[PDB]
Design a protein around this ligand. Sequence first.
Ligand SMILES: [Ca+2]
Length: 139
Amino acid sequence: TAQIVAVTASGYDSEKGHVPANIADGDVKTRWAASGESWVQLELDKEQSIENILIVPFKPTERKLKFSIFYSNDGKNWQPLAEGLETSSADKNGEKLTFTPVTAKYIKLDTFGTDVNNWSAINEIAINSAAALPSRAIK
Ligand SMILES: [Ca+2]
């Protein structure tokens, strides 16, 4: 997948150590988590063509995450890839979201908690992932 060099977030669960970098560590056992309307932003090594993102939400079969995905080349001006998504509860293991390729250095998920409570929690995110996971077109 595309190399993430930096992760930042609106906030995180500091008591439990659910830090932003947890989203990029290739470890499904760790997670970023934050409460209320939140965001996590991934910075790629370079500006490049993007065509999918893989998201492995926390407890995906019990909780659907609401979120929107934005992209930028400058970290200040954002365009939506899609707004008002929910993750799949049918997918144990994560899903890939595909779209019309765009050029981006940054990807930001604005997150709105789940259908269960106001925590947004994500185990993994990857950009241009080749994982064998199911697979849904957005916007
Ligand atoms: Ca992780």
